[PDB]
Short mmCIF file of C-alpha atoms and ligand atoms in Angstrom, two decimals:
data_model
loop_
_atom_site.label_atom_id
_atom_site.label_comp_id
_atom_site.label_asym_id
_atom_site.label_seq_id
_atom_site.Cartn_x
_atom_site.Cartn_y
_atom_site.Cartn_z
CA UNK A 20 -23.89 0.50 -20.88
CA UNK A 21 -23.73 1.17 -17.30
CA UNK A 22 -20.22 1.83 -17.74
CA UNK A 23 -22.05 5.09 -18.37
CA UNK A 24 -24.82 5.32 -15.80
CA UNK A 25 -21.49 4.96 -13.85
CA UNK A 26 -19.28 7.74 -15.26
CA UNK A 27 -22.45 10.03 -15.00
CA UNK A 28 -22.61 8.84 -11.44
CA UNK A 29 -19.07 9.73 -10.46
CA UNK A 30 -19.51 13.01 -12.02
CA UNK A 31 -22.28 13.96 -9.65
CA UNK A 32 -21.91 12.06 -6.31
CA UNK A 33 -18.39 12.56 2.06
CA UNK A 34 -19.12 13.63 -0.83
CA UNK A 35 -16.84 15.38 0.01
CA UNK A 36 -14.43 15.61 -2.59
CA UNK A 37 -11.52 14.11 -0.41
CA UNK A 38 -8.65 13.29 -1.76
CA UNK A 39 -6.44 10.65 -3.13
CA UNK A 40 -5.61 9.43 0.28
CA UNK A 41 -7.85 9.15 2.14
CA UNK A 42 -8.80 7.32 -1.11
CA UNK A 43 -5.84 4.91 -1.15
CA UNK A 44 -6.49 2.71 1.83
CA UNK A 45 -9.92 1.98 0.46
CA UNK A 46 -8.51 0.60 -2.67
CA UNK A 47 -6.15 -1.35 -0.68
CA UNK A 48 -8.56 -3.22 1.36
CA UNK A 49 -10.72 -3.60 -1.67
CA UNK A 50 -8.12 -5.38 -3.70
CA UNK A 51 -7.86 -7.41 -0.58
CA UNK A 52 -11.40 -8.60 -0.67
CA UNK A 53 -11.08 -9.33 -4.40
CA UNK A 54 -8.34 -11.61 -3.57
CA UNK A 55 -10.19 -13.03 -0.65
CA UNK A 56 -13.17 -13.98 -2.83
CA UNK A 57 -11.07 -15.78 -5.47
CA UNK A 58 -9.53 -17.95 -2.74
CA UNK A 59 -12.86 -18.73 -1.33
CA UNK A 60 -13.83 -19.19 -4.92
CA UNK A 61 -16.66 -17.18 -3.63
CA UNK A 62 -18.12 -16.10 -6.92
CA UNK A 63 -21.29 -14.02 -6.17
CA UNK A 64 -18.99 -11.86 -4.07
CA UNK A 65 -16.57 -11.69 -6.65
CA UNK A 66 -19.16 -9.54 -8.55
CA UNK A 67 -19.58 -7.05 -5.84
CA UNK A 68 -15.96 -6.93 -4.81
CA UNK A 69 -15.14 -5.85 -8.27
CA UNK A 70 -17.99 -3.36 -8.56
CA UNK A 71 -15.95 -2.01 -5.66
CA UNK A 72 -12.50 -2.20 -6.94
CA UNK A 73 -13.99 -0.70 -10.14
CA UNK A 74 -15.78 1.96 -8.12
CA UNK A 75 -12.51 3.52 -6.91
CA UNK A 76 -10.82 3.83 -10.32
CA UNK A 77 -13.76 5.89 -11.51
CA UNK A 78 -12.65 8.38 -8.74
CA UNK A 79 -9.14 8.52 -10.16
CA UNK A 80 -10.84 8.86 -13.52
CA UNK A 81 -12.86 11.54 -11.72
CA UNK A 82 -10.28 13.59 -9.94
CA UNK A 83 -7.74 13.12 -12.65
CA UNK A 84 -10.21 14.44 -15.30
CA UNK A 85 -10.56 17.63 -12.97
CA UNK A 86 -6.91 18.33 -13.80
CA UNK A 87 -4.82 18.40 -17.17
CA UNK A 88 -4.47 14.66 -16.82
CA UNK A 89 -7.38 13.84 -19.24
CA UNK A 90 -10.05 11.50 -17.77
CA UNK A 91 -11.46 7.95 -17.81
CA UNK A 92 -11.61 7.19 -21.50
CA UNK A 93 -8.00 8.24 -21.49
CA UNK A 94 -7.20 5.93 -18.68
CA UNK A 95 -8.55 3.13 -20.99
CA UNK A 96 -6.49 4.82 -23.62
CA UNK A 97 -2.89 4.03 -22.40
CA UNK A 98 -3.64 0.45 -21.40
CA UNK A 99 -5.33 0.01 -24.77
CA UNK A 100 -2.41 1.26 -27.00
CA UNK A 101 0.00 -0.99 -24.92
CA UNK A 102 -1.83 -4.31 -25.52
CA UNK A 103 -2.04 -4.07 -29.39
CA UNK A 104 1.65 -3.15 -28.96
CA UNK A 105 19.15 4.55 -10.01
CA UNK A 106 22.01 4.15 -7.61
CA UNK A 107 23.43 1.73 -5.29
CA UNK A 108 21.51 0.10 -2.68
CA UNK A 109 20.92 -2.21 0.19
CA UNK A 110 17.29 -1.72 -0.03
CA UNK A 111 16.84 -3.34 -3.43
CA UNK A 112 14.14 -5.94 -4.18
CA UNK A 113 11.79 -5.46 -1.33
CA UNK A 114 8.57 -5.90 -3.10
CA UNK A 115 6.32 -3.00 -2.60
CA UNK A 116 3.54 -5.46 -2.19
CA UNK A 117 4.71 -6.60 1.26
CA UNK A 118 2.81 -5.97 4.24
CA UNK A 119 3.68 -3.01 6.40
CA UNK A 120 5.23 -4.56 9.32
CA UNK A 121 7.25 -7.11 7.44
CA UNK A 122 8.39 -4.68 4.95
CA UNK A 123 9.56 -2.45 7.81
CA UNK A 124 11.53 -5.47 9.52
CA UNK A 125 12.95 -6.42 6.19
CA UNK A 126 14.52 -2.90 5.60
CA UNK A 127 15.91 -2.86 9.12
CA UNK A 128 17.67 -6.21 8.51
CA UNK A 129 19.19 -4.74 5.38
CA UNK A 130 20.56 -1.83 7.43
CA UNK A 131 21.70 -4.18 10.03
CA UNK A 132 23.75 -6.26 7.63
CA UNK A 133 25.40 -3.17 6.14
CA UNK A 134 26.61 -2.25 9.65
CA UNK A 135 23.88 0.31 10.42
CA UNK A 136 21.93 -0.79 13.65
CA UNK A 137 21.62 -0.07 17.34
CA UNK A 138 23.95 -2.40 18.95
CA UNK A 139 22.32 -2.79 22.20
CA UNK A 140 18.82 -3.21 23.45
CA UNK A 141 18.52 -0.02 25.55
CA UNK A 142 18.16 2.65 22.82
CA UNK A 143 16.04 0.35 20.94
CA UNK A 144 13.57 0.62 23.77
CA UNK A 145 14.43 4.13 24.54
CA UNK A 146 13.11 4.93 21.37
CA UNK A 147 9.63 3.39 21.18
CA UNK A 148 9.11 5.82 24.05
CA UNK A 149 10.68 8.86 22.35
CA UNK A 150 8.23 8.26 19.60
CA UNK A 151 5.30 7.72 21.62
CA UNK A 152 6.24 11.08 23.02
CA UNK A 153 6.25 12.72 19.58
CA UNK A 154 2.90 11.13 18.79
CA UNK A 155 0.94 12.25 21.91
CA UNK A 156 2.74 15.58 21.62
CA UNK A 157 1.13 15.98 18.30
CA UNK A 158 -2.24 14.74 19.32
CA UNK A 159 -2.95 17.38 21.94
CA UNK A 160 -2.07 20.50 19.85
CA UNK A 161 -5.11 22.79 20.01
CA UNK A 162 -5.14 22.36 16.39
CA UNK A 163 -3.82 18.91 15.33
CA UNK A 164 -1.70 18.65 12.21
CA UNK A 165 -3.21 15.56 10.70
CA UNK A 166 -0.05 14.68 8.59
CA UNK A 167 2.48 15.10 11.45
CA UNK A 168 0.23 12.85 13.63
CA UNK A 169 0.22 10.15 10.96
CA UNK A 170 3.84 10.80 10.41
CA UNK A 171 4.58 10.26 14.10
CA UNK A 172 2.23 7.20 14.23
CA UNK A 173 4.55 5.98 11.53
CA UNK A 174 7.82 6.49 13.25
CA UNK A 175 6.38 4.74 16.20
CA UNK A 176 5.58 1.58 14.21
CA UNK A 177 8.81 1.50 12.47
CA UNK A 178 10.19 2.07 16.00
CA UNK A 179 8.62 -0.87 17.55
CA UNK A 180 9.32 -3.25 14.91
CA UNK A 181 12.68 -2.40 15.29
CA UNK A 182 12.20 -3.56 18.70
CA UNK A 183 10.39 -6.84 17.51
CA UNK A 184 13.82 -7.45 15.54
CA UNK A 185 16.09 -6.93 18.57
CA UNK A 186 14.02 -9.20 20.57
CA UNK A 187 14.14 -11.76 17.76
CA UNK A 188 10.46 -12.02 16.91
CA UNK A 189 8.75 -11.34 13.63
CA UNK A 190 6.48 -8.37 13.94
CA UNK A 191 3.95 -9.22 11.17
CA UNK A 192 3.36 -12.65 12.87
CA UNK A 193 3.19 -11.50 16.52
CA UNK A 194 0.48 -9.24 15.62
CA UNK A 195 -1.22 -11.94 13.55
CA UNK A 196 -1.26 -14.05 16.46
CA UNK A 197 -2.62 -11.02 18.57
CA UNK A 198 -5.76 -10.97 16.19
CA UNK A 199 -5.70 -14.72 16.82
CA UNK A 200 -5.79 -14.44 20.69
CA UNK A 201 -8.03 -11.38 20.31
CA UNK A 202 -10.38 -12.81 17.78
CA UNK A 203 -10.47 -15.88 20.10
CA UNK A 204 -11.54 -14.21 23.42
CA UNK A 205 -13.80 -11.85 21.85
CA UNK A 206 -16.04 -14.58 20.33
CA UNK A 207 -15.82 -16.54 23.55
CA UNK A 208 -17.49 -13.28 24.82
CA UNK A 209 -20.05 -12.79 22.06
CA UNK A 210 -21.22 -16.32 22.92
CA UNK A 211 -21.70 -16.03 26.66
CA UNK A 212 -23.70 -12.96 25.92
CA UNK A 213 -25.93 -14.88 23.75
CA UNK A 214 -26.09 -17.67 26.24
CA UNK A 215 -27.84 -15.13 28.48
CA UNK A 216 -30.16 -14.34 25.75
CA UNK A 217 -29.28 -10.69 26.00
CA UNK A 218 -27.72 -9.03 22.98
CA UNK A 219 -24.24 -7.59 22.30
CA UNK A 220 -25.78 -4.24 21.76
CA UNK A 221 -27.74 -5.42 24.84
CA UNK A 222 -24.78 -4.34 26.78
CA UNK A 223 -23.20 -1.77 28.72
CA UNK A 224 -19.45 -1.91 28.49
CA UNK A 225 -19.12 -2.91 32.12
CA UNK A 226 -20.65 -6.34 31.28
CA UNK A 227 -18.45 -6.81 28.27
CA UNK A 228 -15.41 -5.83 30.19
CA UNK A 229 -16.27 -8.16 32.96
CA UNK A 230 -17.08 -11.26 31.01
CA UNK A 231 -13.88 -10.59 28.92
CA UNK A 232 -12.31 -10.75 32.29
CA UNK A 233 -14.13 -14.00 33.28
CA UNK A 234 -12.84 -15.37 29.87
CA UNK A 235 -9.08 -14.65 30.12
CA UNK A 236 -8.73 -15.95 33.71
CA UNK A 237 -10.32 -19.11 32.33
CA UNK A 238 -7.02 -20.55 31.06
CA UNK A 239 -6.00 -21.44 34.66
CA UNK B 27 -15.95 4.67 -25.16
CA UNK B 28 -12.40 3.25 -25.88
CA UNK B 29 -13.58 1.05 -23.08
CA UNK B 30 -15.28 -0.77 -25.93
CA UNK B 31 -11.90 -1.21 -27.79
CA UNK B 32 -10.84 -2.56 -24.52
CA UNK B 33 -13.73 -4.90 -23.71
CA UNK B 34 -12.88 -6.41 -27.00
CA UNK B 35 -9.15 -7.10 -27.17
CA UNK B 36 -10.19 -9.05 -24.29
CA UNK B 37 -12.42 -10.89 -26.79
CA UNK B 38 -9.70 -10.98 -29.40
CA UNK B 39 -7.14 -11.83 -26.75
CA UNK B 40 -8.80 -14.37 -24.61
CA UNK B 41 -10.32 -15.43 -27.96
CA UNK B 42 -11.06 -19.15 -28.25
CA UNK B 43 -9.40 -19.11 -31.32
CA UNK B 44 -7.14 -15.89 -31.78
CA UNK B 45 -4.95 -15.16 -29.72
CA UNK B 46 -3.01 -16.32 -27.45
CA UNK B 47 -0.58 -17.44 -25.35
CA UNK B 48 -0.24 -15.87 -22.73
CA UNK B 49 -3.22 -13.68 -21.75
CA UNK B 50 -5.40 -16.62 -22.64
CA UNK B 51 -3.85 -18.90 -20.08
CA UNK B 52 -4.92 -17.05 -16.95
CA UNK B 53 -7.19 -18.23 -14.18
CA UNK B 54 -8.42 -15.81 -11.50
CA UNK B 55 -6.21 -17.58 -9.03
CA UNK B 56 -3.48 -16.07 -11.08
CA UNK B 57 -4.32 -12.65 -12.23
CA UNK B 58 -4.72 -12.24 -8.40
CA UNK B 59 -1.12 -11.18 -7.74
CA UNK B 60 -0.85 -8.39 -10.25
CA UNK B 61 -3.92 -7.00 -8.86
CA UNK B 62 -1.99 -6.78 -5.63
CA UNK B 63 1.23 -5.44 -7.23
CA UNK B 64 -0.85 -2.87 -9.20
CA UNK B 65 -3.04 -1.82 -6.41
CA UNK B 66 0.42 -1.31 -4.94
CA UNK B 67 1.71 0.81 -7.66
CA UNK B 68 -1.53 2.69 -7.76
CA UNK B 69 -0.76 4.17 -4.38
CA UNK B 70 2.82 4.61 -5.13
CA UNK B 71 1.85 7.37 -7.60
CA UNK B 72 -0.85 9.07 -5.45
CA UNK B 73 1.98 9.35 -2.88
CA UNK B 74 4.79 10.04 -5.46
CA UNK B 75 2.29 12.48 -7.29
CA UNK B 76 3.07 11.14 -10.73
CA UNK B 77 0.30 11.88 -13.37
CA UNK B 78 1.86 10.25 -16.40
CA UNK B 79 2.60 6.98 -14.54
CA UNK B 80 -0.86 7.26 -12.95
CA UNK B 81 -2.97 6.99 -16.14
CA UNK B 82 -0.71 4.18 -17.55
CA UNK B 83 -0.97 2.53 -14.06
CA UNK B 84 -4.66 2.87 -13.36
CA UNK B 85 -5.24 1.41 -16.73
CA UNK B 86 -3.12 -1.65 -16.03
CA UNK B 87 -5.47 -2.01 -13.06
CA UNK B 88 -8.74 -1.14 -14.91
CA UNK B 89 -7.65 -3.88 -17.10
CA UNK B 90 -7.61 -6.45 -14.22
CA UNK B 91 -11.12 -5.43 -13.29
CA UNK B 92 -11.83 -6.37 -16.94
CA UNK B 93 -9.67 -9.39 -17.06
CA UNK B 94 -11.82 -10.79 -14.31
CA UNK B 95 -15.04 -9.67 -15.95
CA UNK B 96 -13.96 -11.50 -19.15
CA UNK B 97 -13.15 -14.79 -17.42
CA UNK B 98 -16.28 -14.42 -15.19
CA UNK B 99 -18.26 -14.21 -18.30
CA UNK B 100 -16.49 -17.11 -19.97
CA UNK B 101 -17.96 -19.25 -17.21
CA UNK B 102 -21.11 -17.16 -17.92
CA UNK B 103 -21.37 -15.59 -14.40
CA UNK B 104 -21.42 -11.94 -15.37
CA UNK B 105 -20.24 -9.31 -17.77
CA UNK B 106 -18.11 -6.27 -17.37
CA UNK B 107 -21.36 -4.59 -17.73
CA UNK B 108 -23.40 -6.49 -14.96
CA UNK B 109 -20.31 -5.30 -12.88
CA UNK B 110 -21.10 -1.64 -13.52
CA UNK B 111 -24.78 -2.28 -12.55
CA UNK B 112 -23.87 -4.07 -9.42
CA UNK B 113 -22.27 -0.80 -8.21
CA UNK B 114 -24.20 1.48 -10.40
CA UNK B 115 -27.20 -0.02 -8.38
CA UNK B 116 -25.63 0.08 -5.11
CA UNK B 117 -23.98 3.44 -5.07
CA UNK B 118 -27.05 5.05 -6.57
CA UNK B 119 -29.20 3.74 -3.88
CA UNK B 120 -27.44 6.13 -1.40
CA UNK B 121 -28.99 9.07 -3.32
CA UNK B 122 -29.79 11.75 -3.25
CA UNK B 123 -20.55 -12.37 15.04
CA UNK B 124 -18.80 -9.18 13.85
CA UNK B 125 -15.57 -10.85 13.41
CA UNK B 126 -17.21 -12.79 10.69
CA UNK B 127 -15.83 -12.11 7.33
CA UNK B 128 -12.77 -10.18 8.04
CA UNK B 129 -10.31 -12.01 5.46
CA UNK B 130 -6.84 -13.47 6.52
CA UNK B 131 -4.60 -12.52 3.69
CA UNK B 132 -5.04 -9.02 5.29
CA UNK B 133 -1.99 -7.38 6.95
CA UNK B 134 -1.67 -7.39 10.78
CA UNK B 135 -2.07 -3.71 10.94
CA UNK B 136 -5.21 -3.72 8.64
CA UNK B 137 -6.78 -6.57 10.28
CA UNK B 138 -6.24 -5.32 13.78
CA UNK B 139 -7.71 -1.92 13.02
CA UNK B 140 -10.59 -3.83 11.14
CA UNK B 141 -11.19 -6.36 13.78
CA UNK B 142 -11.00 -3.44 16.22
CA UNK B 143 -13.30 -1.09 14.27
CA UNK B 144 -15.42 -4.16 14.42
CA UNK B 145 -15.83 -4.59 18.12
CA UNK B 146 -16.28 -0.90 18.28
CA UNK B 147 -19.52 -0.86 16.27
CA UNK B 148 -21.12 -2.96 19.02
CA UNK B 149 -19.45 -0.47 21.43
CA UNK B 150 -16.61 -2.68 22.63
CA UNK B 151 -13.86 -0.15 22.88
CA UNK B 152 -12.23 2.36 25.00
CA UNK B 153 -14.23 5.33 25.81
CA UNK B 154 -11.19 7.70 26.32
CA UNK B 155 -7.72 8.25 24.87
CA UNK B 156 -5.95 8.22 28.19
CA UNK B 157 -6.07 4.66 28.94
CA UNK B 158 -5.76 3.42 25.35
CA UNK B 159 -2.22 4.86 25.67
CA UNK B 160 -1.73 3.72 29.01
CA UNK B 161 -2.11 0.10 27.93
CA UNK B 162 0.65 0.47 25.56
CA UNK B 163 3.01 1.31 28.27
CA UNK B 164 1.62 -1.51 30.22
CA UNK B 165 2.53 -3.86 27.55
CA UNK B 166 5.87 -2.77 26.78
CA UNK B 167 6.44 -3.58 30.37
CA UNK B 168 5.13 -6.99 29.74
CA UNK B 169 7.55 -7.33 26.91
CA UNK B 170 10.53 -6.29 29.05
CA UNK B 171 9.48 -8.70 31.69
CA UNK B 172 9.55 -11.48 29.23
CA UNK B 173 12.65 -10.09 27.79
CA UNK B 174 14.85 -10.29 30.84
CA UNK B 175 14.46 -13.53 32.45
CA UNK B 176 17.52 -15.67 33.24
CA UNK B 177 15.79 -18.03 30.80
CA UNK B 178 13.84 -16.30 28.12
CA UNK B 179 10.63 -18.08 27.25
CA UNK B 180 10.66 -17.21 23.38
CA UNK B 181 6.96 -18.19 23.03
CA UNK B 182 5.80 -15.90 25.85
CA UNK B 183 8.05 -13.25 24.52
CA UNK B 184 6.41 -13.26 20.99
CA UNK B 185 2.85 -13.22 22.48
CA UNK B 186 3.46 -10.22 24.66
CA UNK B 187 5.04 -8.55 21.75
CA UNK B 188 2.01 -9.51 19.63
CA UNK B 189 0.04 -7.43 22.02
CA UNK B 190 2.39 -4.49 22.08
CA UNK B 191 1.60 -4.30 18.40
CA UNK B 192 -2.05 -4.56 18.83
CA UNK B 193 -2.09 -1.94 21.48
CA UNK B 194 -0.31 0.24 19.26
CA UNK B 195 -2.92 -0.06 16.46
CA UNK B 196 -5.51 0.49 19.15
CA UNK B 197 -3.92 3.83 19.54
CA UNK B 198 -3.08 4.75 15.95
CA UNK B 199 -6.77 4.46 15.47
CA UNK B 200 -8.45 6.49 18.16
CA UNK B 201 -5.90 8.95 17.11
CA UNK B 202 -7.99 8.69 13.96
CA UNK B 203 -5.19 7.52 11.56
CA UNK B 204 -4.80 4.06 9.84
CA UNK B 205 -1.88 2.02 11.19
CA UNK B 206 -0.93 0.05 8.14
CA UNK B 207 -0.91 3.21 6.28
CA UNK B 208 1.03 5.09 8.83
CA UNK B 209 3.70 2.23 8.61
CA UNK B 210 3.72 2.34 4.82
CA UNK B 211 4.56 6.11 4.98
CA UNK B 212 7.29 5.71 7.54
CA UNK B 213 8.91 2.90 5.64
CA UNK B 214 8.87 5.20 2.69
CA UNK B 215 10.40 8.23 4.39
CA UNK B 216 13.11 6.03 5.88
CA UNK B 217 13.86 4.26 2.71
CA UNK B 218 14.21 7.58 0.97
CA UNK B 219 16.50 8.71 3.62
CA UNK B 220 19.05 5.90 4.01
CA UNK B 221 19.17 5.73 0.26
CA UNK B 222 20.50 9.21 0.28
CA UNK B 223 22.96 8.77 3.08
CA UNK B 224 24.10 5.89 0.89
CA UNK B 225 24.46 7.98 -2.21
CA UNK B 226 26.16 10.49 0.10
CA UNK B 227 28.51 7.76 1.36
CA UNK B 228 29.57 6.74 -2.16
CA UNK B 229 30.14 10.16 -3.68
CA UNK B 230 32.29 10.16 -0.41
CA UNK B 231 35.33 9.23 -2.39
CA UNK B 232 35.87 5.56 -2.14
CA UNK B 233 36.66 3.75 1.12
CA UNK B 234 37.99 1.61 0.70
CA UNK B 235 38.98 3.84 3.66
CA UNK B 236 32.16 5.58 10.03
CA UNK B 237 29.96 4.96 11.55
CA UNK B 238 29.09 8.62 12.33
CA UNK B 239 29.51 9.62 9.42
CA UNK B 240 27.00 6.59 9.42
CA UNK B 241 24.72 7.94 12.27
CA UNK B 242 25.74 11.52 11.61
CA UNK B 243 25.16 11.88 7.84
CA UNK B 244 21.76 10.28 8.73
CA UNK B 245 20.89 13.25 10.98
CA UNK B 246 22.53 15.63 8.55
CA UNK B 247 20.04 14.32 6.02
CA UNK B 248 17.13 14.66 8.51
CA UNK B 249 17.64 18.28 8.28
CA UNK B 250 18.70 18.65 4.53
CA UNK B 251 15.05 17.55 3.73
N1 ATP C 314 19.98 2.67 13.25
C1 ATP C 314 19.43 3.84 13.65
N2 ATP C 314 20.18 4.80 14.24
C2 ATP C 314 19.64 5.97 14.65
N3 ATP C 314 18.34 6.28 14.50
C3 ATP C 314 17.48 5.41 13.93
C4 ATP C 314 17.99 4.11 13.46
N4 ATP C 314 16.94 3.45 12.94
C5 ATP C 314 15.85 4.26 13.06
N5 ATP C 314 16.17 5.42 13.65
C6 ATP C 314 15.23 6.54 13.95
O1 ATP C 314 15.96 7.76 14.03
C7 ATP C 314 15.52 8.71 13.05
C8 ATP C 314 15.02 9.97 13.75
O2 ATP C 314 13.81 9.68 14.43
P1 ATP C 314 12.62 10.77 14.48
O3 ATP C 314 11.37 10.09 14.99
O4 ATP C 314 13.14 12.00 15.19
O5 ATP C 314 12.41 11.13 12.93
P2 ATP C 314 13.03 12.48 12.31
O6 ATP C 314 12.53 12.62 10.89
O7 ATP C 314 14.52 12.48 12.58
O8 ATP C 314 12.35 13.63 13.21
P3 ATP C 314 10.76 13.65 13.43
O9 ATP C 314 10.43 12.24 13.86
O10 ATP C 314 10.56 14.69 14.51
O11 ATP C 314 10.21 14.04 12.08
C9 ATP C 314 14.41 8.06 12.24
O12 ATP C 314 14.82 7.96 10.87
C10 ATP C 314 14.23 6.67 12.81
O13 ATP C 314 14.52 5.69 11.80
MG1 MG C 315 9.20 10.75 14.99
#
């Protein structure tokens, strides 16, 4: 009955109102922990990780209520009532669920098959560039247009994947393995800190950067 | 308050008893996907802007949060309600190694930002935009090195392109956006767009009898929207 402390908590709470996006990618990573926990069978987590997941949805309950759209009990209206009871296209059956990079590469393959690709390397590359241009361009406006930045940050990732394809590599992996090499070195580095006894907030960035250097020229 | 009519049907549905085939046959390890799928529809709407779908949809999600809460409480771990009071207790009290415990599951984009926000909170990070960006550049160049040899070393090649990607998340963030999200959006805009060309190219009589046309209608759509 908490369920209510909780409604009466979402009415009432950065904080900020804000928005529905930025709201989104909080949900997303949240669902990701839920799933993480189930695979670890980690069950005490599971109880927080779903507080969390459930936290969001009270927002959407929230913000929705604030418009003609009718609020939380209503939410649990639809879903209730159900349980007692396009054209063409090369892009079909790409689950939405797929992660970003891989769903980008996947799309580009489709276009490729259907005859719609760059057909040499050069303008593939040309273009990562053109797009980095449009990104930095945006970024240094005296007043930034948040959207157009993000938009441009987009086009650049789709751009560079497209390069991953022409080189024949799979972008979602590559970067997986970059958090692998990265994750690796970095802990190498947390550890030779602690070997000194000093802390990791017991450093200056010079020391970090220079150990990190020690570290990577330690594979030859 | 319908919530209650909900918490139930769950009773009467995961019911020992009556029903059922098929809602009664679910572990956690298997609800898990439709939580993903739904989370994924739940943003489709708040990017499509679709307020009918979005009740209907949120509910199918609420519902998971409950589905777990039933099952949790069949093994007697906790009740939908304990779930409220975990958060209820843990919002309210805001009022009035740091790569441990970053998942794997998690997309490249999200986990490089995350890993990255992570070394940042122990200030391991770049201090100024300029040479974030530079290092992209630098890494691109690494890529083309790899990319041009008389004999390409495919392995090498992948790695250095790993890092191009990382670099570029290093930037997207720092430019204070979220890469995986920025990709999602771009992906959508594109997919929208081709789509159209495609419905343009069909309309287009028949052929039967390109490609620019192909590359042209594309740009002529670029403007159109
Ligand atoms: N096969 C292709 N041929 C031509 N262009 C392509 C191809 N694949 C991707 N592109 C890129 O070219 C298009 C134009 O790039 P751009 O970054 O200018 O986006 P835009 O919407 O046209 O303009 P802006 O980026 O300024 O909004 C994008 O849709 C992007 O996909
Ligand atoms: Mg662009």
